[PDB]
Amino acid sequence: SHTDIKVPDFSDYRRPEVLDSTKSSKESSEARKGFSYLVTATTTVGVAY
Amino acid sequence: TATYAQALQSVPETQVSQLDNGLRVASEQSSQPTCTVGVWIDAGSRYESEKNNGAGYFVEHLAFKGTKNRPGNALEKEVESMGAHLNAYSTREHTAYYIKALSKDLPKAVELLADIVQNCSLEDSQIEKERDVILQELQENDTSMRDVVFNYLHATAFQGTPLAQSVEGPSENVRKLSRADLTEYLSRHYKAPRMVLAAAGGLEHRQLLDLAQKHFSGLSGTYDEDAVPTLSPCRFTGSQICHREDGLPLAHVAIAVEGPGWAHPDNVALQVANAIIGHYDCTYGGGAHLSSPLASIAATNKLCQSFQTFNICYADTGLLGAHFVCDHMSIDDMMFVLQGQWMRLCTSATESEVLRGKNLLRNALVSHLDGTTPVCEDIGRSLLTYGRRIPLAEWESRIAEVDARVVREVCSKYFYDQCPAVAGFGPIEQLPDYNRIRSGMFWLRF
Amino acid sequence: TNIRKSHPLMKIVNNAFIDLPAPSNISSWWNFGSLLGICLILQILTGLFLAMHY
Amino acid sequence: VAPTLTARLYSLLFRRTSTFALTIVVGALFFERAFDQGADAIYEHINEGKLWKHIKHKYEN
Amino acid sequence: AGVPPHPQDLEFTRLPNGLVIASLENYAPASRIGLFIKAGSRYENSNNLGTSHLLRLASSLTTKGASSFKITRGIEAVGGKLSVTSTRENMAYTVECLRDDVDILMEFLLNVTTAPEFRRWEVAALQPQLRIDKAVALQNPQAHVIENLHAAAYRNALANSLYCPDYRIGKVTPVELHDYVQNHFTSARMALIGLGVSHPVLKQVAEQFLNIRGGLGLSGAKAKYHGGEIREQNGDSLVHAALVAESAAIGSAEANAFSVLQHVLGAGPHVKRGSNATSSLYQAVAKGVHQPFDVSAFNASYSDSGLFGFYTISQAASAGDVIKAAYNQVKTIAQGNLSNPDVQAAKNKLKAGYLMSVESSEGFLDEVGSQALAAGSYTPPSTVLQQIDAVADADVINAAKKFVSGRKSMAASGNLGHTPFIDEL
Amino acid sequence: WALVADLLTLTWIGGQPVEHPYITIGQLASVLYFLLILVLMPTAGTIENKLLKW
Amino acid sequence: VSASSRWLEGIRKWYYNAAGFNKLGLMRDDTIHENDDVKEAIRRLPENLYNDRVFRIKRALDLSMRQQILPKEQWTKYEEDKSYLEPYLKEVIRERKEREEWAKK
Amino acid sequence: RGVAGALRDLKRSVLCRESLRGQAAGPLVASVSL
Amino acid sequence: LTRFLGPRYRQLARNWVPTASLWGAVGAVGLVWATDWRLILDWVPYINGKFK
Ligand SMILES: CCCCCCCCCCCCCC(=O)OC[C@H](COP(=O)([O-])OCC[N+](C)(C)C)OC(=O)CCCCCCCCCCCCC
Ligand code: HEM
Ligand SMILES: CCCCCC(=O)OC[C@H](COP(=O)([O-])OCCN)OC(=O)CCCCC
Ligand SMILES: CCCCCC(=O)OC[C@H](COP(=O)([O-])OCCN)OC(=O)CCCCC
């Protein structure tokens, strides 16, 4: 019965690089992590100033 | 007098042959009086669609229940009467049927496997009987938290892809699966280029290849139609699934990152790193003096009843991580010590412990290939995944190449600052939030 | 096991600002607790630096 | 096409936390001069001819 | 070509002190060394029950030649293994490692078996593990049923459980462990078995370290069959029940007859999810019972006695119908209803299963070690098949007759409202 | 008590002018302060361990 | 064995009576400072020696409260001072040294 | 790992008749390791 | 005191030298930037906006 438990669809929330279920996510892992950390780095550069 | 390196050379070469219809035939001869023979098929739930999911697991229930030439009990009575044993299993990528029998019973054993794989009856009266049986098995599996939490891990890690599907299938598909769905599954996937006849024990490769021509020749091969299956990649998703159930006395947690897949050379170094972390159970004798810091701390402070690392391999993908079970107030401490060892190996692995991981792997590899049935499995599965039998001397070469630098580079490539797939089940109120888990995949000091 | 939880000093900070179970749905009207703490500190720093000349 | 700039920024600068900090402290050094230089240029332009540095040359000697 | 080498023969030697060395050089990458000892739970008495369980758990405590820390780290460093397997008759200390590290693990093995200190504080810290070990074991309902089956069958020395009685957890003293090792871990009660090791080095090790002169001779404390029944009313979903009679001591020709009778009746399946056509016990119960159940012939052969019968699992209400159907099926064989093809298929299952059980080094080492203590010899497999072929149809029938007429022993657990007593069968 | 009396000496010297012989006494007491804490008192504890045979 | 070793023993008996813990009935191992090694050794003492250690420390703390001492007849004689804890503490240290030597490899 | 052999945390449930076969015993053996 | 003298402890020092050298650069550059230290800053190309 736990085999009935499918995970809901998050297509409304996924980023564009993660929409295709047949493409590996490793191809965009560095870019996606780099963007959110660039936001953090620029934020720290602002508070430092 | 013979050294360990010399003993690896003494293992007989695994002879491989291929019929004209694409059926590969592999064997490893020994002096044993017994043997194991079976057919490994490149089929599983990853090939099934949502509508016919669980069809392979359904066929497994029907494979031994009757054939055109041996209807009903006839197959069992032949196997049982010669003291042989008949078994089968199905993963997400491989299906297998194998027999254990005497060496003199080799021709009868191969003959039965041919009649099973090719001429399955699939009587409608039997399909309805196995319909209720699989449903009971689904209720049974629900009580195994380990089977549940690993299905959840696949469900969330490979969400939206075939690998998310479980082998047994959902309860609704077992109820509406018709005989036509199953025959469609067989003619589509049980094709000679996708099967491997493996044997191991006391037998010459000639008589196996002769029996392969004698019984498996009548099988369409090398060109079926324009209906060729091909496994596309499967997206990995960093995600979390939490089944809160405070009625169960112990929580189950499975956490993992994306692995590379079968053919990648990095699996050797990953298994060395997993061997350093190792595994623990409350019945182990070592306790506080164990080498693995996670096992030592888990036994000293009683953080869990058990844990195990794993490196599950699929085509071009896999699940690399660990699974544990513990009291409801130890889920946080256990996750902290676990992630701290991934980070410690990513950044500051040392040479001695890496040698231990190589030695644990050498012992594990030779201890596993002891018996005709393990070796027959290694032959069948390897020919589907690797396209060859990798000799033990080659595994020793790849293990001996690993050092502390390889582990630091290889572990960082797959662990450091990566989104894990988390699956939880039981009293998991204290299971850390995913962001806190994601923050445990890097160190601010590094 | 964990230094953040067992040290006599860090466990008070940990059980107040880090591992404190808080509701998932508190709105912006719950931000004024910390803002009052900031204003009090902000008034003490500027207040002290004015007392060096007043 | 090679991987995007954000991908090469991650693996080269942001993966290690130590280089992630070195990027920030170096980015803070150039940001301060570039921002103070540009920001002052906007303030003086909006107030052209009114600040003392504009009428300074009239009273040289 | 791809053929294997010429397989060597097993070397076998008896020393004058009673010790038995047996080795086989299979040229494998791994080595395996076992020290088999006549020290199982049968040599406990009513004053030191459970001492051999705690001893089984104390293999990594401190020795005179190696501390507990060194044993754990030293074995794990080479990826080795140290195990202790116990039956009601034997304790078997087994050690495994790559063949280049045999010397290191041999030294640990001898220290664990011939120089344990049993430190007062180390033993005290280990006592709660008896409760954890026993709790993990007893969550299989088979374990407690067979504990009670032996408690009911024998007055002494096999009634002793494999696991420590609850009242003894924390009461086993270091003196009792020292006395147990001095009394039972002696030359005439031991056998040093090795795989991937040469015969000279084992014989050398045997003469240097394993020459411990008998503190207690080969005991004549013979197991006395008595019979009876132990019933455990609990909240399990299914009734487990075993019905048994005294059969025969191991190694005798009558033992082989019961082993054939076991496979005539059925003992474990051969096909995944199979109807078990050739199992006469299963088909006999399936006649009058259509609920889920299981039934299997039980065969337990020891040095000076044996227990043969069958084991049932059924719904609580079908417990009597399953047991009576199975017991009647044994009667028809005792009345003579047994074909020759039926006996030949049983001999094939027995002969095939024996060979399969010695494919692996783990199963081969255990067989050679058990033969060395039970028989003082090594009987090759072709001779074992010869002894199985010598079993006559009449021998199988007379074994069934001995069960039907013998004083019974019975153990059952579950909701026993419809589980018969012995006199009701 | 050599540390106390030496500190009572530095106290006394501190309230006196920097002239002979207070200059020399203040230097001796200053070296004796750091010598007692860094060298002599640690050495005494070791001698005391040997006299008790541990 | 000689007259000079009796003078080393002579000053040790002098320092012993100067240390003065024998005046409270204590023994030398009662006065040791409890580090992790010492705590383990005390943990390993048999029941009788543990209970004896506890009462002597209790009796000495009771005397220290009153600023009193025992009569001279009940002082601990230097010749009778039993090093009941040293064999346990030597073994605890030896084990730690082994753990510390494995950590170097 | 500890082992108990007889056939020659809530564990799970065994309900159907197919999963029951092999559960009936067929002499106990207690193994312990590191 | 002499517990940390062996092969493993020298391997650990090797693994953390690249990290410890970077935190020193973060501290050094952070000290020069925080204090406007003109001894070092005068050599940097774009931060020569001093006009002595
Ligand atoms: C005496 C002279 C000394 C001068 C020294 C100057 C040093 C300047 C700062 C450099 C340190 C950076 C440390 C760092 O970068 O590690 C902090 C953390 C990381 O960021 P992450 O989570 O991306 O993980 C990172 C994961 N990776 C590494 C794989 C990408 O940064 C964050 O998370 C927090 C960022 C948010 C900023 C706001 C905090 C201020 C408080 C409130 C202000 C307003 C009211 C008062
Ligand atoms: C809750 C904290 C505080 C509040 C609400 C507060 C509020 C005020 C206000 C409204 C004024 C009038 C300022 C003006 O009209 O110019 C004032 C004056 C002053 N306060 Fe505070 N203050 C606080 C804390 C402090 C502290 C801690 C100090 C000293 C360490 C301090 C020192 C002064 C001084 C010296 C003045 C006179 C200078 C002036 O008028 O600007 N204040 N305070
Ligand atoms: C002088 C610089 C001090 C740096 C301390 C720091 O940034 O704290 C850690 C967190 C982010 O790291 P994490 O919580 O993912 O832990 C990672 C575990 N591997 O950052 C914040 O969000 C906390 C807010 C601090 C407010 C003062
Ligand atoms: C810990 C308190 C330090 C206080 C230093 C201070 O206030 O700033 C002085 C100088 C100014 O930069 P400079 O190029 O004029 O240099 C003029 C030199 N007098 O900055 C420095 O040189 C920083 C030196 C840091 C040493 C610890």
Cα–Cα distance, B190 to B47 (Å, whole number): 12
Q: Which of I35, I41, I52 to mutate to test the pocket of ligand 4 (most atoms within 8 A of CB)?
A: I35
Pull the structure tokens for residue E404.
Answer: 């039907």
Cα–Cα distance, E143 to E335 (Å, whole number): 33
Q: Which residues contact F49 (CB under 8 A, 6 or more apart)?
A: none
Pull the structure tokens for residue B406.
Answer: 């390889």
Domain span at residue B170 reads: 14-228
Pull the structure tokens for residue I52.
Answer: 């002595």
Contact B2, B10 (CB under 8 A): yes
CA atoms within 13 A on the CB side of G28: 23
**Residues E276 and E184 placed together within one structural domain of the fold:** no
B90: helix, strand or coil:
strand
Chain B residues inside the 8 Å CB shell of C1: 297, 301, 303, 333, 336-337
Q: Report the gap between the CA of I9 and the closest CA in chain G (Å).
A: 6
End of a domain among E171, E192, E213? E213
Fill in the amino acid letter for E355. L
| Nearest residue to G76 (alpha-carbon basis) of G105, G52, G100 | G52
Cα–Cα distance, B404 to B355 (Å, whole number): 9
Cα–Cα distance, G81 to G27 (Å, whole number): 6
Pull the structure tokens for residue B35.
Answer: 């043997």
- Cβ B442 under 6 angstroms from ligand 3: yes
- Spatial strand order of the sheet with E20-24 comes to E11-14, E20-24, E190-195, E30-37, E91-98, E81-86, H29-32, H3-5
B280: helix, strand or coil:
strand
**Residues E250 and E283 placed together within one structural domain of the fold:** yes
Contact B74, B86 (CB under 8 A): no
Beta strand residue intervals within B42-154, DSSP E: 85-90, 95-102
Residue of the CA atom closest to atom 26 of ligand 1:
D17
Cα–Cα distance, E359 to B126 (Å, whole number): 36
Contact B154, B321 (CB under 8 A): no
Contact B181, B17 (CB under 8 A): no
Cis before residue F21, ω within 30 degrees of 0? yes
Contact E35, E92 (CB under 8 A): yes
Residue of the CA atom closest to atom 18 of ligand 4:
I37
**Residues B326 and B362 placed together within one structural domain of the fold:** yes
Q: How far is CA F44 from the centre of its chain?
A: 14
Number of F to G CB contacts under 8 A, please give it: 14
| CATH assignment of the domain containing E411 | 3.30.830.10
Sign of CA dihedral E281, E283, E284, E290: positive
I11/B404 touch (CB, cutoff 8 Å), yes or no: yes
> Rounded to the nearest whole angstrom, what is the distance from the C-alpha of residue B334 to the centroid of ligand 1?
28
Cα–Cα distance, B324 to G53 (Å, whole number): 44
Cα–Cα distance, H11 to H19 (Å, whole number): 14
**Residues E163 and E271 placed together within one structural domain of the fold:** no
Chain E residues inside the 8 Å CB shell of G99: 69
I3/G105 touch (CB, cutoff 8 Å), yes or no: no
Residue of the CA atom closest to atom 42 of ligand 1:
A47
Sign of CA dihedral B257, B260, B262, B268: negative
Contact E76, B356 (CB under 8 A): yes
Domain membership of residue E219 (yes or no) is no
Pull the structure tokens for residue B357.
Answer: 């991981």
Sign of CA dihedral B121, B126, B132, B136: negative
Domain membership of residue B6 (yes or no) is no
Fill in the amino acid letter for B360. L
Domain membership of residue B382 (yes or no) is yes
> Rounded to the nearest whole angstrom, what is the distance from the C-alpha of residue H24 to the centroid of ligand 1?
63
Q: Which residues contact H25 (CB under 8 A, 6 or more apart)?
A: E142, E145, E146, E242, E296, E298, E311, H6, H7
- Cβ B336 under 6 angstroms from ligand 3: no
Q: How far is CA B290 from CA B50, B115, B269, B279, E122, in A?
A: 46, 51, 22, 10, 16
Contact B96, B88 (CB under 8 A): yes
Number of structural domains found in chain G? 1
Q: Which residue has the tokens 């650990």?
A: I12
Please tell me what DSSP assigns to residue A7.
P
Instruction: Provide the total of helices (H) and of strands (E) in chain B, helices listed first.
Output: 17, 12
Structural element, H or E, at residue B423 = strand B421-426
**Residues E107 and E188 placed together within one structural domain of the fold:** yes
| Nearest residue to E400 (alpha-carbon basis) of E269, E272, E263, E305 | E263
Fill in the amino acid letter for D17. T
Cα–Cα distance, B391 to B333 (Å, whole number): 41
Contact H22, E269 (CB under 8 A): yes
Domain membership of residue B404 (yes or no) is yes
Domain span at residue G63 reads: 1-105
Contact E244, B49 (CB under 8 A): no
Contact B216, B197 (CB under 8 A): yes
**Residues E206 and E58 placed together within one structural domain of the fold:** yes
Q: Which residue has the tokens 């795989």?
A: E195
> Relative to the CA of C50, which ligand 2 atom is closest?
35
Chain H residues inside the 8 Å CB shell of E145: 25
> Relative to the CA of I32, which ligand 4 atom is closest?
23
- Provide the angle, in degrees to the nearest 10, between the axes of the packed helices E340-356 and E381-389: 160
Domain span at residue E55 reads: 3-213
Cα–Cα distance, H5 to H25 (Å, whole number): 9
| CATH assignment of the domain containing D15 | 1.20.5.260
Cα–Cα distance, B185 to B120 (Å, whole number): 12
Contact G33, F52 (CB under 8 A): no
| Nearest residue to B339 (alpha-carbon basis) of B409, B273, B416, B275 | B416
Cα–Cα distance, E133 to E140 (Å, whole number): 12
Q: How far is CA D42 from CA B123, D28, E35, H16, I48, in A?
A: 86, 21, 90, 82, 21
Domain membership of residue E241 (yes or no) is yes
**Residues E386 and E413 placed together within one structural domain of the fold:** yes
Q: Is B261 left (phi over 0), alpha (psi -120 to 50) or beta?
A: left
**Residues E337 and E270 placed together within one structural domain of the fold:** yes
Cα–Cα distance, E298 to E277 (Å, whole number): 19
**Residues E175 and E293 placed together within one structural domain of the fold:** no
Pull the structure tokens for residue E172.
Answer: 């086993």
Q: Which of C41, C44, C48 to mutate to test the pocket of ligand 2 (most atoms within 8 A of CB)?
A: C44
- What are the structural domains of chain I? 1-52 (1.20.5.220)
Q: Report the gap between the CA of F22 and the closest CA in chain G (Å).
A: 37
Cα–Cα distance, E131 to E129 (Å, whole number): 5
Number of structural domains found in chain D? 1
Interface residues from chain B to H (CB-CB < 8 Å): 133, 136-137, 139-141, 143-145, 248-250, 281, 283-286, 290, 305, 325
Structural element, H or E, at residue B37 = strand B34-41
**Residues B80 and B201 placed together within one structural domain of the fold:** yes
| Nearest residue to E129 (alpha-carbon basis) of E66, E50, E188 | E50
Q: Which residues contact B394 (CB under 8 A, 6 or more apart)?
A: none
| Nearest residue to B306 (alpha-carbon basis) of B105, B174, B196, B146 | B146
B445/I7 touch (CB, cutoff 8 Å), yes or no: no
Contact E37, E189 (CB under 8 A): yes
**Residues E104 and E234 placed together within one structural domain of the fold:** no
> Rounded to the nearest whole angstrom, what is the distance from the C-alpha of residue A44 to the centroid of ligand 1?
6
Q: What are phi and psi of B190, to 5 degrees?
A: -85, 65
B138/A3 touch (CB, cutoff 8 Å), yes or no: yes
**Residues E9 and E148 placed together within one structural domain of the fold:** yes
**Residues B213 and B245 placed together within one structural domain of the fold:** no
Cα–Cα distance, A49 to I34 (Å, whole number): 10
What is the C-alpha end-to-end distance of chain G, expressed in Å? 45
Contact E327, E244 (CB under 8 A): no
Q: How was this structure determined?
A: X-ray
Instruction: Kindly tell me whether chain H and chain B come into contact, counting contact as 3+ Cβ pairs under 8 Å.
Output: yes
Q: Which residues contact D18 (CB under 8 A, 6 or more apart)?
A: B446, I19, I22, I23, I26
End of a domain among B173, B195, B228? B228
Cα–Cα distance, B152 to A6 (Å, whole number): 9
Domain membership of residue E220 (yes or no) is no
Q: What are phi and psi of C52, to 5 degrees?
A: -75, -10
Contact B150, B323 (CB under 8 A): yes
Q: Which residue has the tokens 């402070």?
A: B301
> Relative to the CA of B439, which ligand 3 atom is closest?
15
Cα–Cα distance, B136 to B129 (Å, whole number): 11
- Cβ I37 under 6 angstroms from ligand 4: yes
What residues form DSSP beta bridges with E28?
A: none
3-state secondary structure chain E: CCCCCCCCCCEEEECCCCCEEEEECCCCCEEEEEEEECCCHHHCCCCCCCHHHHHHCCCCCCECCCCHHHHHHHHHHCCCEEEEEECCCCEEEEEEEEHHHHHHHHHHHHHHHHCECCCHHHHHHHHHHHHHHHHHHCCCHHHHHHHHHHHHHECCCCCCCCCCCHHHCCCCCHHHHHHHHHHHCCHHHEEEEEECCCHHHHHHHHHHCCCCCCCCCCCCCCCCECCEEEEEECCCCCEEEEEEEECCCCCCHHHHHHHHHHHHHCCCCCECCCCCCCCHHHHHHHHHCCCCEEEEEEEEECCCCEEEEEEEEECHHHHHHHHHHHHHHHHHHHCCCCCHHHHHHHHHHHHHHHHHCCCCHHHHHHHHHHHHHHCCCCCCHHHHHHHHHCCCHHHHHHHHHHHHHCCEEEEEEECCCCCCCHHHC
What is the C-alpha end-to-end distance of chain A, expressed in Å? 57
Instruction: Kindly tell me whether chain C and chain G come into contact, counting contact as 3+ Cβ pairs under 8 Å.
Output: no
Q: Report the gap between the CA of E217 and the closest CA in chain H (Å).
A: 25
**Residues B295 and B400 placed together within one structural domain of the fold:** yes
Q: Which residue has the tokens 């739970």?
A: E41
Pick from D9, D35, D36 the residue to mutate for testing the A interface (most A CBs within 10 Å).
Answer: D9
Please tell me what DSSP assigns to residue B319.
E
Cα–Cα distance, E135 to E144 (Å, whole number): 11
Q: Which residues contact E28 (CB under 8 A, 6 or more apart)?
A: B7, B366, E99, E195, E196, E361
Sign of CA dihedral E51, E54, E60, E61: negative
Number of structural domains found in chain E? 2
Q: What are phi and psi of B421, to 5 degrees?
A: -100, 120
Active site residues of B: 60
Pull the structure tokens for residue E295.
Answer: 């039934």
**Residues B211 and B255 placed together within one structural domain of the fold:** no
| CATH assignment of the domain containing B395 | 3.30.830.10
Widest Cα–Cα separation across chain C: 51
**Residues E284 and E176 placed together within one structural domain of the fold:** no
D28/I33 touch (CB, cutoff 8 Å), yes or no: yes
B86/E271 touch (CB, cutoff 8 Å), yes or no: yes
Chain A residues inside the 8 Å CB shell of D20: 37, 41
D17/B445 touch (CB, cutoff 8 Å), yes or no: yes
- Spatial strand order of the sheet with E228-233 comes to E228-233, E408-414, E239-246, E306-314, E293-301
Taking the CA of C53 as reference, the closest ligand is 2
Q: Which of B169, B237, B417 sits opposite A3 (nearest CB)?
A: B169
Pull the structure tokens for residue E302.
Answer: 């020891």
Structural element, H or E, at residue B199 = strand B195-201
Please tell me what DSSP assigns to residue D56.
G
Cα–Cα distance, E363 to E356 (Å, whole number): 9
Q: Which of H9, H12, H33 sits opposite B285 (nearest CB)?
A: H33
Does B431 lie at the interface with C, CB-CB under 8 angstroms? no
Fill in the amino acid letter for E118. F
- Provide the angle, in degrees to the nearest 10, between the axes of the packed helices E68-77 and G86-102: 10
Chain D residues inside the 8 Å CB shell of A28: 7
| Nearest residue to B284 (alpha-carbon basis) of B275, B272, B276, B292 | B292
Cα–Cα distance, E220 to E304 (Å, whole number): 10
Cα–Cα distance, A3 to E198 (Å, whole number): 54
H10/B133 touch (CB, cutoff 8 Å), yes or no: no
Which value, to the nearest 10 degrees, does the dihedral of the CA atoms of residues B394, B396, B397, B400 take? Answer: 170
Q: Alpha helix locations (H) across chain G?
A: 5-19, 36-43, 47-66, 86-102
- Provide the angle, in degrees to the nearest 10, between the axes of the packed helices B351-368 and I7-35: 130
Domain span at residue D58 reads: 1-61
Pull the structure tokens for residue E412.
Answer: 């059952």
Widest Cα–Cα separation across chain B: 70
Does D51 lie at the interface with A, CB-CB under 8 angstroms? no
| Nearest residue to E65 (alpha-carbon basis) of E108, E126, E16, E128 | E108
Cα–Cα distance, B31 to B28 (Å, whole number): 10
Domain membership of residue B277 (yes or no) is yes
- What are the structural domains of chain A? 2-2+7-49 (1.20.5.270)
Cα–Cα distance, A24 to A40 (Å, whole number): 26
Cα–Cα distance, B64 to B111 (Å, whole number): 14
Q: Is B130 left (phi over 0), alpha (psi -120 to 50) or beta?
A: alpha
D28/A45 touch (CB, cutoff 8 Å), yes or no: yes
Cα–Cα distance, E415 to E236 (Å, whole number): 7
Contact B353, E73 (CB under 8 A): no
Please tell me what DSSP assigns to residue D59.
G
Q: Report the gap between the CA of D1 and the closest CA in chain I (Å).
A: 32
What residues form DSSP beta bridges with B41?
A: B95, B195
Q: Going by DSSP bridges, is the β-strand pair B95-102/B85-90 parallel, antiparallel, or unpaired?
A: antiparallel
Widest Cα–Cα separation across chain F: 49
Q: Report the gap between the CA of I2 and the closest CA in chain B (Å).
A: 19
Cα–Cα distance, G58 to G54 (Å, whole number): 6
| Nearest residue to E384 (alpha-carbon basis) of E358, E406, E403 | E358
Q: Report the gap between the CA of G93 and the closest CA in chain I (Å).
A: 13
Q: What are phi and psi of B126, to 5 degrees?
A: -80, -35
Number of structural domains found in chain B? 2
Residue E408 burial (10 A CB sphere; 0-12, 13-18, 19+): buried
> Rounded to the nearest whole angstrom, what is the distance from the C-alpha of residue I48 to the centroid of ligand 4?
18
Beta strand residue intervals within H1-34, DSSP E: 3-5, 29-32
Which value, to the nearest 10 degrees, does the dihedral of the CA atoms of residues B196, B198, B203, B205 take? Answer: 30
> Rounded to the nearest whole angstrom, what is the distance from the C-alpha of residue B444 to the centroid of ligand 3?
8
| CATH assignment of the domain containing G1 | 1.10.1090.10
Fill in the amino acid letter for E86. S
Contact B161, H30 (CB under 8 A): no
Chain B residues inside the 8 Å CB shell of H19: 136-137, 140
